[PDB]
Short mmCIF file of C-alpha atoms and ligand atoms in Angstrom, two decimals:
data_model
loop_
_atom_site.label_atom_id
_atom_site.label_comp_id
_atom_site.label_asym_id
_atom_site.label_seq_id
_atom_site.Cartn_x
_atom_site.Cartn_y
_atom_site.Cartn_z
CA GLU A 433 33.63 32.88 -49.49
CA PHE A 434 35.27 30.96 -50.22
CA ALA A 435 36.00 28.03 -47.48
CA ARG A 436 38.54 27.36 -45.98
CA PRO A 437 39.76 24.12 -44.40
CA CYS A 438 41.55 23.83 -40.15
CA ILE A 439 44.95 24.33 -39.41
CA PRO A 440 44.76 20.77 -37.57
CA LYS A 441 46.73 20.88 -33.70
CA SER A 442 46.90 17.99 -31.18
CA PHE A 443 47.83 19.04 -27.88
CA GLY A 444 48.29 15.02 -27.13
CA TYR A 445 43.80 14.08 -27.00
CA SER A 446 41.88 12.44 -28.85
CA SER A 447 41.55 14.64 -32.16
CA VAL A 448 42.66 17.30 -33.50
CA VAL A 449 41.38 21.11 -32.25
CA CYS A 450 41.29 24.23 -35.85
CA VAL A 451 44.02 26.94 -35.26
CA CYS A 452 42.63 30.16 -35.94
CA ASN A 453 44.13 33.32 -35.49
CA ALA A 454 44.58 37.60 -37.15
CA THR A 455 43.77 36.73 -40.67
CA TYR A 456 43.45 32.58 -40.91
CA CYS A 457 40.32 30.82 -39.73
CA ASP A 458 38.06 27.58 -40.70
CA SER A 459 35.07 28.56 -42.63
CA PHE A 460 32.98 27.46 -45.13
CA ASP A 461 31.13 28.23 -48.89
CA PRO A 462 27.71 30.84 -48.73
CA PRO A 463 21.15 19.84 -52.57
CA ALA A 464 20.44 19.34 -56.31
CA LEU A 465 17.27 17.00 -57.28
CA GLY A 466 18.31 13.62 -56.70
CA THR A 467 20.92 14.25 -55.16
CA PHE A 468 21.67 15.08 -50.72
CA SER A 469 24.05 17.00 -49.33
CA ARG A 470 25.98 14.75 -46.36
CA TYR A 471 28.89 16.62 -43.77
CA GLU A 472 31.13 14.16 -41.48
CA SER A 473 33.24 15.13 -38.20
CA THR A 474 35.32 12.34 -37.63
CA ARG A 475 37.80 12.00 -34.93
CA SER A 476 40.46 11.37 -37.25
CA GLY A 477 41.00 15.10 -38.00
CA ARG A 478 37.44 15.82 -40.34
CA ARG A 479 36.25 19.40 -40.28
CA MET A 480 32.45 19.40 -41.18
CA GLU A 481 33.15 17.48 -44.22
CA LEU A 482 30.96 18.14 -48.32
CA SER A 483 29.96 15.29 -50.35
CA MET A 484 27.31 14.93 -51.93
CA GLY A 485 25.00 11.46 -53.08
CA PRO A 486 22.44 9.73 -54.70
CA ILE A 487 19.30 9.26 -53.14
CA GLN A 488 18.58 5.85 -54.77
CA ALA A 489 14.31 4.93 -55.88
CA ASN A 490 15.24 1.48 -54.36
CA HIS A 491 16.68 -0.15 -52.06
CA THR A 492 17.03 -4.51 -51.03
CA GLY A 493 19.45 -5.98 -48.23
CA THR A 494 19.16 -7.42 -44.23
CA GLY A 495 21.48 -3.46 -43.32
CA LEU A 496 20.22 -1.22 -41.32
CA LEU A 497 17.66 0.90 -42.40
CA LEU A 498 16.15 4.53 -40.81
CA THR A 499 12.79 5.02 -42.10
CA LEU A 500 11.32 8.57 -41.13
CA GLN A 501 7.74 9.50 -40.23
CA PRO A 502 7.36 12.69 -42.07
CA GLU A 503 3.72 13.07 -40.79
CA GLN A 504 4.41 11.69 -36.90
CA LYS A 505 4.82 15.65 -36.34
CA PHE A 506 6.53 16.63 -32.46
CA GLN A 507 8.62 19.90 -31.26
CA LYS A 508 9.49 23.40 -33.34
CA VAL A 509 12.63 24.22 -32.97
CA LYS A 510 13.51 27.45 -30.55
CA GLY A 511 17.79 27.55 -32.23
CA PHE A 512 20.94 26.61 -30.35
CA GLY A 513 24.06 28.64 -29.14
CA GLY A 514 25.96 30.00 -25.68
CA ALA A 515 25.97 32.33 -23.06
CA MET A 516 27.83 35.30 -22.66
CA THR A 517 29.80 35.34 -19.28
CA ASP A 518 32.01 38.21 -18.23
CA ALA A 519 34.74 35.20 -18.47
CA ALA A 520 33.79 34.53 -22.27
CA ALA A 521 33.66 38.06 -23.46
CA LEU A 522 36.97 38.95 -21.09
CA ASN A 523 38.60 35.85 -23.55
CA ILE A 524 37.86 37.29 -26.15
CA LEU A 525 38.01 40.84 -26.24
CA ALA A 526 41.84 39.20 -25.30
CA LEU A 527 42.53 38.76 -29.10
CA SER A 528 42.58 41.34 -31.81
CA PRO A 529 39.87 43.22 -33.59
CA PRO A 530 40.04 40.99 -36.41
CA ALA A 531 40.70 37.78 -34.54
CA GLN A 532 37.28 38.51 -32.54
CA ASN A 533 35.48 39.13 -35.46
CA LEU A 534 36.71 35.57 -36.60
CA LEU A 535 35.84 33.98 -33.10
CA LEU A 536 32.42 36.29 -33.37
CA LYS A 537 31.66 35.16 -37.05
CA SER A 538 32.88 30.73 -36.67
CA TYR A 539 29.10 31.52 -33.41
CA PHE A 540 27.10 33.52 -35.50
CA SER A 541 27.97 33.93 -39.92
CA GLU A 542 26.24 31.65 -42.07
CA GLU A 543 30.02 31.26 -43.38
CA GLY A 544 30.41 30.18 -39.03
CA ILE A 545 27.85 27.60 -37.76
CA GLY A 546 24.08 29.98 -37.44
CA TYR A 547 23.88 30.08 -33.48
CA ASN A 548 20.13 32.07 -32.94
CA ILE A 549 20.83 32.11 -28.56
CA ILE A 550 23.01 34.27 -26.31
CA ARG A 551 22.79 33.14 -22.87
CA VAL A 552 23.20 36.43 -20.62
CA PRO A 553 23.56 36.67 -17.34
CA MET A 554 22.24 39.14 -15.30
CA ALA A 555 25.02 40.42 -13.21
CA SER A 556 28.02 38.44 -11.89
CA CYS A 557 27.64 34.16 -11.57
CA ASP A 558 31.13 32.30 -10.49
CA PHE A 559 32.63 33.37 -14.67
CA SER A 560 33.24 36.90 -13.75
CA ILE A 561 36.88 37.80 -12.30
CA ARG A 562 34.17 40.33 -9.39
CA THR A 563 31.08 40.19 -7.68
CA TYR A 564 28.80 42.46 -8.07
CA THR A 565 24.98 42.98 -8.77
CA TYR A 566 23.46 45.51 -10.18
CA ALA A 567 22.06 47.45 -7.27
CA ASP A 568 25.08 47.40 -4.25
CA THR A 569 24.17 49.92 -2.41
CA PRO A 570 21.79 48.66 0.79
CA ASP A 571 18.16 49.06 1.41
CA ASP A 572 17.83 50.83 -2.13
CA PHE A 573 14.21 49.10 -2.55
CA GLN A 574 13.26 51.83 -4.86
CA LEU A 575 16.30 50.54 -6.72
CA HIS A 576 17.24 53.81 -7.96
CA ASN A 577 20.95 52.97 -7.26
CA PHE A 578 20.52 50.22 -10.69
CA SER A 579 22.92 49.78 -12.36
CA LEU A 580 25.10 48.59 -15.29
CA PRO A 581 28.63 48.34 -15.13
CA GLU A 582 31.88 48.00 -17.35
CA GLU A 583 31.01 44.59 -18.10
CA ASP A 584 27.88 45.06 -19.73
CA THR A 585 28.30 48.17 -20.98
CA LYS A 586 32.15 48.58 -21.84
CA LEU A 587 32.54 43.69 -22.17
CA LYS A 588 29.36 42.04 -23.06
CA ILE A 589 26.46 44.71 -24.47
CA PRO A 590 28.85 45.83 -27.79
CA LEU A 591 30.41 41.84 -27.98
CA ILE A 592 26.71 41.36 -28.76
CA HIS A 593 26.15 43.67 -30.71
CA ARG A 594 28.42 42.66 -33.32
CA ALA A 595 27.82 38.95 -32.56
CA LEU A 596 24.40 40.58 -33.56
CA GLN A 597 25.33 41.98 -36.44
CA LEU A 598 27.48 38.82 -38.12
CA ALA A 599 24.37 36.91 -37.84
CA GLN A 600 21.30 36.81 -40.95
CA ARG A 601 19.23 34.55 -38.39
CA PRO A 602 17.24 36.19 -36.48
CA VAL A 603 19.23 35.86 -32.83
CA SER A 604 17.17 35.04 -28.89
CA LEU A 605 18.39 36.58 -26.62
CA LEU A 606 17.91 34.80 -22.75
CA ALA A 607 18.67 36.27 -19.26
CA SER A 608 19.77 34.24 -15.75
CA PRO A 609 20.20 36.18 -12.86
CA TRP A 610 22.70 33.97 -10.52
CA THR A 611 22.07 36.37 -7.02
CA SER A 612 19.87 39.36 -5.95
CA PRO A 613 21.59 41.89 -3.85
CA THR A 614 22.74 40.64 -0.95
CA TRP A 615 20.10 43.22 1.58
CA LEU A 616 17.66 40.93 -0.03
CA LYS A 617 19.04 37.42 0.94
CA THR A 618 18.35 35.38 4.18
CA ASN A 619 22.29 35.20 4.39
CA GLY A 620 23.30 38.52 3.52
CA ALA A 621 25.74 37.06 1.56
CA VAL A 622 26.24 36.46 -2.37
CA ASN A 623 26.40 32.92 -2.15
CA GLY A 624 25.09 30.67 0.20
CA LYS A 625 21.98 28.81 1.47
CA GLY A 626 20.41 31.75 1.60
CA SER A 627 16.63 32.88 0.39
CA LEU A 628 14.74 36.51 -0.42
CA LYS A 629 13.77 37.30 3.08
CA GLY A 630 10.33 37.46 3.48
CA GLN A 631 7.31 35.84 0.85
CA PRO A 632 6.12 36.07 -2.17
CA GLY A 633 3.82 38.85 -2.58
CA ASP A 634 6.30 41.44 -0.16
CA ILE A 635 8.54 44.78 -0.56
CA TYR A 636 11.88 41.99 -1.41
CA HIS A 637 9.28 40.15 -3.39
CA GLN A 638 8.62 42.65 -5.42
CA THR A 639 11.39 44.61 -5.38
CA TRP A 640 12.98 41.42 -7.30
CA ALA A 641 10.97 41.15 -9.65
CA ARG A 642 11.13 44.94 -10.64
CA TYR A 643 14.67 44.55 -10.51
CA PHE A 644 13.92 41.99 -13.60
CA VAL A 645 12.37 45.53 -16.03
CA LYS A 646 15.57 47.41 -14.60
CA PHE A 647 17.93 45.13 -16.20
CA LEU A 648 15.43 44.71 -19.40
CA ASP A 649 15.40 48.91 -19.26
CA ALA A 650 19.08 49.62 -19.16
CA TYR A 651 19.55 47.00 -21.47
CA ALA A 652 16.85 48.21 -24.12
CA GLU A 653 18.29 51.53 -23.70
CA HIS A 654 22.30 50.16 -25.08
CA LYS A 655 19.54 48.85 -28.77
CA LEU A 656 19.14 45.32 -27.41
CA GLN A 657 15.70 43.83 -26.34
CA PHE A 658 15.26 39.62 -24.46
CA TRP A 659 13.57 36.84 -26.08
CA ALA A 660 12.90 35.58 -22.60
CA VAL A 661 14.68 35.76 -18.70
CA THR A 662 14.89 32.43 -16.83
CA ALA A 663 12.67 32.60 -13.16
CA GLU A 664 16.53 32.41 -11.52
CA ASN A 665 20.05 30.30 -12.36
CA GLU A 666 19.30 27.29 -10.47
CA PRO A 667 16.75 28.17 -7.89
CA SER A 668 18.42 24.44 -6.49
CA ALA A 669 21.75 25.95 -5.46
CA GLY A 670 20.85 28.29 -3.14
CA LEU A 671 18.58 25.42 -0.65
CA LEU A 672 22.45 23.80 -0.23
CA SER A 673 24.85 24.83 2.60
CA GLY A 674 27.75 26.01 1.41
CA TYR A 675 26.79 26.15 -1.03
CA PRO A 676 30.14 28.49 -3.07
CA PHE A 677 29.27 30.21 -6.33
CA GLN A 678 26.30 33.00 -6.38
CA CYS A 679 23.05 31.53 -5.77
CA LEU A 680 19.57 32.36 -4.74
CA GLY A 681 17.52 29.61 -3.19
CA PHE A 682 14.16 28.45 -4.35
CA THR A 683 11.88 25.92 -3.10
CA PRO A 684 9.19 24.27 -6.60
CA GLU A 685 6.68 26.07 -3.81
CA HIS A 686 8.45 29.31 -3.65
CA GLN A 687 9.30 29.84 -7.10
CA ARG A 688 5.50 28.75 -8.23
CA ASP A 689 4.08 31.89 -5.57
CA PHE A 690 6.85 34.39 -6.74
CA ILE A 691 5.41 33.78 -10.13
CA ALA A 692 1.99 34.52 -10.06
CA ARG A 693 3.12 36.81 -7.12
CA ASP A 694 5.69 38.87 -8.06
CA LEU A 695 6.93 38.55 -10.68
CA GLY A 696 4.80 37.87 -13.57
CA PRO A 697 2.78 40.60 -12.55
CA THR A 698 4.79 42.69 -12.80
CA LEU A 699 6.59 41.57 -16.20
CA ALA A 700 3.03 41.65 -17.75
CA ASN A 701 2.72 44.51 -16.50
CA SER A 702 5.56 46.38 -17.88
CA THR A 703 6.82 46.93 -21.68
CA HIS A 704 8.58 44.28 -21.92
CA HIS A 705 5.04 41.59 -21.29
CA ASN A 706 5.71 39.96 -25.06
CA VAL A 707 9.64 38.94 -23.04
CA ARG A 708 8.35 35.34 -22.81
CA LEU A 709 9.33 33.58 -18.55
CA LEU A 710 11.09 30.12 -18.45
CA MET A 711 10.90 27.97 -15.00
CA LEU A 712 13.58 26.40 -13.57
CA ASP A 713 16.53 26.22 -15.06
CA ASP A 714 17.61 24.15 -13.89
CA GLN A 715 19.24 19.19 -13.13
CA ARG A 716 16.78 18.11 -15.60
CA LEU A 717 15.22 15.41 -12.45
CA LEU A 718 13.54 17.75 -10.84
CA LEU A 719 11.02 17.49 -13.49
CA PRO A 720 7.91 16.26 -13.27
CA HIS A 721 7.99 17.35 -9.54
CA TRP A 722 8.62 20.95 -9.79
CA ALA A 723 5.91 21.94 -13.00
CA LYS A 724 3.63 19.81 -11.51
CA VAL A 725 4.36 21.96 -8.25
CA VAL A 726 4.30 25.36 -10.61
CA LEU A 727 2.08 25.13 -13.25
CA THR A 728 -1.02 23.01 -12.08
CA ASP A 729 -1.25 26.19 -10.40
CA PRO A 730 -2.97 28.47 -12.38
CA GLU A 731 -2.33 31.99 -11.33
CA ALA A 732 1.46 31.23 -12.02
CA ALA A 733 0.89 28.58 -14.98
CA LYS A 734 -0.16 31.85 -16.81
CA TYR A 735 2.66 33.19 -17.20
CA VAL A 736 5.73 30.55 -17.39
CA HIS A 737 6.29 30.14 -20.96
CA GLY A 738 8.33 27.06 -20.79
CA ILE A 739 10.65 24.47 -18.50
CA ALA A 740 14.38 25.35 -18.56
CA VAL A 741 16.97 22.41 -18.03
CA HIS A 742 20.21 21.67 -17.48
CA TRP A 743 22.51 18.93 -18.01
CA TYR A 744 24.61 18.44 -14.71
CA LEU A 745 23.39 15.56 -13.05
CA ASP A 746 21.52 13.20 -15.88
CA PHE A 747 23.15 10.34 -16.03
CA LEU A 748 20.51 10.75 -11.91
CA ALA A 749 17.51 11.70 -15.08
CA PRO A 750 16.79 9.09 -17.67
CA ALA A 751 14.54 11.74 -20.60
CA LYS A 752 11.74 9.84 -20.72
CA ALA A 753 10.99 9.73 -16.66
CA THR A 754 11.13 13.33 -16.74
CA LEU A 755 11.34 14.66 -19.59
CA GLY A 756 8.95 12.61 -21.57
CA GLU A 757 7.37 12.59 -18.87
CA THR A 758 7.01 16.93 -18.18
CA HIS A 759 6.12 17.05 -21.60
CA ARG A 760 3.24 14.62 -21.47
CA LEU A 761 1.71 16.27 -18.60
CA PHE A 762 2.46 19.22 -19.76
CA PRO A 763 2.56 19.02 -24.03
CA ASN A 764 1.88 22.93 -23.89
CA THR A 765 5.63 24.53 -21.51
CA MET A 766 8.06 23.91 -23.91
CA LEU A 767 11.56 22.49 -22.24
CA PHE A 768 14.22 24.07 -23.17
CA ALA A 769 18.40 22.44 -22.66
CA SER A 770 19.21 26.37 -20.95
CA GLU A 771 23.20 25.66 -19.75
CA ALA A 772 25.62 22.60 -20.10
CA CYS A 773 29.57 22.20 -19.91
CA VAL A 774 32.02 19.23 -19.82
CA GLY A 775 35.35 19.83 -17.75
CA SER A 776 32.70 20.52 -13.91
CA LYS A 777 32.34 17.51 -11.71
CA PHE A 778 36.45 17.43 -9.11
CA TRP A 779 37.62 14.56 -10.40
CA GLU A 780 37.79 15.89 -14.43
CA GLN A 781 40.90 18.59 -16.97
CA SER A 782 38.97 21.82 -16.79
CA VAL A 783 40.55 21.95 -20.47
CA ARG A 784 41.26 19.25 -22.92
CA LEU A 785 42.03 20.33 -25.98
CA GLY A 786 41.54 18.45 -28.40
CA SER A 787 39.15 15.32 -27.12
CA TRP A 788 36.88 13.33 -29.69
CA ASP A 789 34.56 12.19 -26.20
CA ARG A 790 33.34 16.25 -24.86
CA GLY A 791 32.33 16.77 -28.37
CA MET A 792 29.51 12.86 -28.59
CA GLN A 793 28.84 13.96 -24.85
CA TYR A 794 27.72 17.14 -26.67
CA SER A 795 26.54 15.61 -30.42
CA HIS A 796 24.80 12.37 -27.24
CA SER A 797 22.87 15.18 -24.77
CA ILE A 798 21.79 17.62 -27.88
CA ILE A 799 19.60 14.64 -30.03
CA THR A 800 18.37 12.55 -26.88
CA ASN A 801 17.06 16.65 -25.61
CA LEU A 802 15.37 16.18 -28.95
CA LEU A 803 14.05 13.13 -29.11
CA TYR A 804 12.48 14.08 -25.45
CA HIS A 805 10.66 16.83 -27.45
CA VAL A 806 13.03 20.12 -26.26
CA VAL A 807 12.67 22.57 -28.51
CA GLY A 808 16.48 23.40 -27.95
CA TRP A 809 19.81 23.93 -26.14
CA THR A 810 22.47 26.30 -24.76
CA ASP A 811 26.65 25.96 -24.28
CA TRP A 812 27.46 27.35 -20.78
CA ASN A 813 31.12 29.80 -21.80
CA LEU A 814 31.56 30.88 -25.20
CA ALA A 815 34.70 31.06 -25.15
CA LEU A 816 37.40 30.13 -21.77
CA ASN A 817 41.12 30.23 -21.60
CA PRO A 818 43.42 26.67 -21.56
CA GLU A 819 42.86 26.95 -18.07
CA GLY A 820 39.15 27.29 -18.26
CA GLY A 821 38.61 30.54 -17.00
CA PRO A 822 38.75 33.14 -15.87
CA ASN A 823 36.78 32.32 -12.02
CA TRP A 824 36.65 33.89 -10.06
CA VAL A 825 35.64 30.75 -7.38
CA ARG A 826 37.76 29.26 -9.86
CA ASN A 827 35.50 26.82 -11.02
CA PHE A 828 37.22 26.10 -14.69
CA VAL A 829 35.49 23.78 -17.38
CA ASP A 830 36.13 23.42 -20.66
CA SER A 831 34.45 25.56 -23.96
CA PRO A 832 33.95 24.79 -27.42
CA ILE A 833 36.46 27.69 -28.13
CA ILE A 834 40.35 28.11 -26.25
CA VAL A 835 41.16 31.54 -26.45
CA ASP A 836 45.66 32.11 -25.75
CA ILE A 837 45.63 35.46 -25.32
CA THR A 838 49.62 36.29 -25.58
CA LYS A 839 49.09 34.69 -29.48
CA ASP A 840 46.46 36.15 -30.39
CA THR A 841 45.20 32.60 -31.13
CA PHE A 842 41.77 30.63 -30.48
CA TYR A 843 40.94 27.11 -31.10
CA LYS A 844 37.75 25.61 -32.43
CA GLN A 845 36.93 21.79 -30.51
CA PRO A 846 35.78 18.93 -31.01
CA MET A 847 32.69 20.32 -28.82
CA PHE A 848 32.01 23.06 -31.55
CA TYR A 849 31.83 21.35 -34.79
CA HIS A 850 29.09 18.23 -32.86
CA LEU A 851 27.59 21.46 -31.84
CA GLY A 852 27.63 22.54 -35.21
CA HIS A 853 26.08 19.74 -37.32
CA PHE A 854 22.76 21.42 -35.13
CA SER A 855 23.13 24.44 -35.28
CA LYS A 856 24.15 24.96 -39.26
CA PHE A 857 21.79 22.56 -40.40
CA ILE A 858 19.13 23.07 -37.79
CA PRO A 859 17.06 27.14 -38.03
CA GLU A 860 14.10 28.40 -35.55
CA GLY A 861 10.93 26.67 -37.20
CA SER A 862 11.79 23.58 -37.73
CA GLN A 863 10.08 20.85 -36.29
CA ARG A 864 11.50 16.84 -34.91
CA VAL A 865 9.72 13.71 -37.50
CA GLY A 866 9.24 10.37 -36.18
CA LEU A 867 12.71 8.39 -37.23
CA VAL A 868 12.43 4.33 -36.81
CA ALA A 869 15.02 1.64 -37.24
CA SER A 870 15.06 -1.34 -37.98
CA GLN A 871 17.44 -3.06 -35.95
CA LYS A 872 19.03 -2.67 -33.04
CA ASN A 873 22.14 -0.84 -33.33
CA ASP A 874 24.57 1.78 -31.45
CA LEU A 875 24.21 4.98 -33.76
CA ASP A 876 22.22 8.30 -31.84
CA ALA A 877 20.53 10.08 -34.94
CA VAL A 878 17.36 12.69 -35.25
CA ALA A 879 14.89 13.36 -37.59
CA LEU A 880 13.10 16.93 -38.67
CA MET A 881 11.88 18.58 -41.24
CA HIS A 882 12.63 22.35 -42.15
CA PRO A 883 10.14 25.44 -42.04
CA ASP A 884 10.53 24.63 -46.09
CA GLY A 885 9.58 20.71 -45.46
CA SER A 886 13.21 19.53 -46.41
CA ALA A 887 15.01 17.23 -44.78
CA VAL A 888 17.98 16.72 -41.88
CA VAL A 889 18.41 14.11 -39.99
CA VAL A 890 22.17 14.11 -37.87
CA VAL A 891 23.92 10.12 -36.80
CA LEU A 892 25.92 9.98 -33.92
CA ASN A 893 27.92 6.69 -34.07
CA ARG A 894 29.40 6.23 -30.43
CA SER A 895 30.65 3.14 -31.54
CA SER A 896 34.69 2.30 -32.74
CA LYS A 897 32.79 -0.43 -35.62
CA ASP A 898 31.65 1.37 -39.07
CA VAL A 899 28.00 0.80 -39.29
CA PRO A 900 26.53 0.19 -42.86
CA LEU A 901 22.92 2.36 -43.14
CA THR A 902 19.70 3.11 -45.47
CA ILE A 903 17.82 5.75 -44.93
CA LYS A 904 14.59 5.27 -46.21
CA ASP A 905 12.63 8.62 -47.31
CA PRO A 906 9.04 7.17 -47.93
CA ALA A 907 7.81 8.19 -51.15
CA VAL A 908 11.12 9.89 -51.79
CA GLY A 909 13.44 6.72 -51.91
CA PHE A 910 16.73 5.55 -50.04
CA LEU A 911 20.23 7.08 -49.13
CA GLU A 912 23.10 4.24 -48.74
CA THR A 913 25.74 6.36 -46.05
CA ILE A 914 28.10 4.50 -43.96
CA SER A 915 28.37 5.52 -40.38
CA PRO A 916 32.48 5.91 -39.44
CA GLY A 917 32.76 5.16 -35.56
CA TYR A 918 32.62 7.99 -33.55
CA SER A 919 31.82 9.72 -36.82
CA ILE A 920 29.05 12.28 -36.95
CA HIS A 921 26.98 12.76 -39.43
CA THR A 922 24.45 15.73 -41.91
CA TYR A 923 22.00 14.80 -43.74
CA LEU A 924 20.55 17.04 -45.85
CA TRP A 925 17.83 16.28 -49.37
CA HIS A 926 14.64 18.68 -50.33
CA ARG A 927 12.31 16.37 -50.74
CA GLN A 928 10.19 17.77 -54.12
C1 LIG B 1481 47.89 32.01 -38.73
O1 LIG B 1481 47.30 31.26 -39.08
C2 LIG B 1481 47.78 30.58 -40.69
C3 LIG B 1481 47.34 28.99 -40.99
O2 LIG B 1481 48.08 28.12 -40.40
C4 LIG B 1481 48.89 31.22 -40.97
O3 LIG B 1481 49.75 31.39 -42.48
C5 LIG B 1481 49.89 29.64 -42.60
O4 LIG B 1481 51.81 29.90 -42.26
C6 LIG B 1481 52.27 28.65 -42.90
C7 LIG B 1481 53.40 27.83 -41.81
O5 LIG B 1481 54.38 29.31 -42.01
C8 LIG B 1481 52.25 28.15 -44.37
O6 LIG B 1481 52.74 26.89 -44.70
C9 LIG B 1481 53.66 26.89 -44.94
O7 LIG B 1481 54.09 26.81 -46.17
C10 LIG B 1481 55.22 26.52 -46.28
C11 LIG B 1481 54.77 25.86 -48.61
O8 LIG B 1481 54.47 26.67 -49.08
C12 LIG B 1481 55.26 25.78 -46.76
O9 LIG B 1481 57.65 25.07 -46.31
C13 LIG B 1481 55.97 25.35 -44.12
O10 LIG B 1481 56.32 24.00 -44.03
C14 LIG B 1481 54.46 26.11 -44.10
O11 LIG B 1481 53.68 24.64 -44.66
C15 LIG B 1481 51.27 28.72 -45.00
O12 LIG B 1481 50.88 28.55 -46.26
C16 LIG B 1481 50.40 29.75 -44.15
N1 LIG B 1481 48.94 29.86 -45.03
C17 LIG B 1481 47.86 30.54 -45.43
C18 LIG B 1481 46.02 30.64 -45.61
O13 LIG B 1481 48.58 32.08 -45.73
C19 LIG B 1481 49.71 32.58 -40.27
O14 LIG B 1481 50.82 32.43 -40.08
C20 LIG B 1481 51.60 33.33 -40.56
O15 LIG B 1481 51.88 34.00 -41.86
C21 LIG B 1481 52.89 32.35 -42.54
C22 LIG B 1481 51.84 33.36 -44.32
C23 LIG B 1481 53.97 33.02 -42.61
O16 LIG B 1481 54.86 34.16 -42.88
C24 LIG B 1481 54.69 31.97 -41.26
O17 LIG B 1481 55.23 32.75 -40.50
C25 LIG B 1481 53.13 33.29 -40.21
O18 LIG B 1481 52.49 32.80 -38.70
C26 LIG B 1481 49.72 32.14 -38.79
N2 LIG B 1481 49.61 33.98 -38.56
C27 LIG B 1481 50.67 34.14 -37.61
C28 LIG B 1481 50.73 35.14 -37.00
O19 LIG B 1481 51.25 32.67 -36.55
#
C-alpha cells in the first residue's frame, strides 16, 4: 500500500511520538544495482525515512572508514519482537477494531516493522490485573483442574492469531512462567522468597514439568504452537526476601537438576519434543557462571538449546566478560535477549512520551548484543497505558506503543522506530559478519548478510556531533554518507 507519514506530537520530551487512531497510522510502501538504500530516524523527527545513494568504485580521504569483512561469519539471527502480557492485551483490545488492526500491523506486517517473535507469559505476572495460575486448585498433583482462563482464551490467544494472520514472515512464540501454583512452593505464595518444595526428580518437580506440557497442549488446542520455552522467568528473583512480583526461585544447581531430571525428559517425551528449551532467562551478569553449572552436566546439557538474558543489570556486566566469554566456552548454545524495557528503576519516570534517549537505549543494547553473538532481542510489553500499566504491583514501565483508551488513539515512540531499524531489515537467518573501523569513533554499528547474500548495516550515533563516514564493501564499492548527531540509520545493498 501507499506509505503514510508520521503525525508528530510533542509531549515536552526530547522528541516526538507518531499519533495513530482508528483511521490513520504511519506505514511503509511494500535498491537497483550499484545503489544503496538508507533508512534514517533522527531526534528532530525523521521516522525511518527512505533515501538512496550510489555505490562508488573508489574512495580517497582521511575520514572514518567502516570496512565490511563478509568472510568473517558469526551468529545467525532468530529474530525480534515483544511480549503479549495481559496488560498489553487489555490495552490493545481497549481500542476500536480498526485501531487495533493498525497497532498490530505496525508491529507484525511488512507495511510495519516485521516482528517475528511473541513472548507469552505462562499465567500471571506483574503485568496482569489479578494473580492466578493455570492450576490453583490446591494439591491437584494430577493437574485434573489445569485450565486456561479468559486472559488466555479471550485476550491473548485471539490477539496472537491476528498477529500471525497479519505477518508475512513466520512468527515464533516463546513461553515463560513467573510462578507455579502456590501449593508447589515452599512459601505458599505467588511472590516472595520461595522455590518448588522438595528436590528435582520428586513429585513436586514432576508435577511442575507436567504443567509446561499441559500449557503447550492447551495452546495447541487453540491452534498455537511454540518455538521455545524458558525454564523460569528470572529464577534468581525467588531467592530474594520479599521479592514483590510473581517468581519461583532456582539456584543454578537447582535449575541444572530440574532440567536434567524433570523438565528435559518430560518435554522430550511429549508431542512437544521439538519445542526448544532456554535456560537462565535472567540478568547477563549471571554468565558465564550459570552456563558452566548447567551445561557441564551432560544430563542437563542434552536438553538445553539456548540461554536467555534480560537487560536490567547490564551496567554491572560488560558484554565481553559475560556474553563473549559464554560464547567462547559454549559456542553451540545460542544466546538470546528475551526481555528489556526502560522506566523500571525506582527513580525513573515510567513513561516519557517521545523520549529519544529511550530509543537510543534500545538500539545501543541491540547492537551491543549482536556484536557479542546474541541471536535476537525481545521487548517486554507490546503496549501500555500512559501510566505504564496496568500492573497489580504498580511496577509501571515504558513501552514502544502507548494506548490512550478514552481517545481511541495510540502513540508510537522513538523506541518503536529504533527497534524497527533492526526488526524490519534483519530477517530470520541473517548472519552477522565482520565490520572494522579505521579510527576511534562514537558510533555503534553492526553488519549482517541476509539469507540472499545482500548486506545490511545499522549505525547509531551516540554523540551530538555529525560524523561523515564511508562504508567499504571489499570488491563491491564504497558508500559515502553522514551520520547526524543522535541519529540511527539502516543501510541495505545488493552485493551482486
Ligand atoms: C486520525 O488521525 C488523522 C491524521 O492525523 C486525522 O485526520 C487528519 O485531520 C487533520 C487535522 O484535523 C487534517 O489536517 C488539517 O488539514 C487542513 C488543510 O486541508 C488544515 O486547515 C488543518 O489545519 C489541518 O492541518 C488532515 O487532513 C487529516 N488527515 C487525513 C489523512 O485524513 C483524524 O482527524 C479526523 O479526521 C479529519 C479528516 C478531520 O475531520 C478531523 O476533524 C478529525 O479529527 C484522526 N481521527 C480522529 C477521530 O481524530
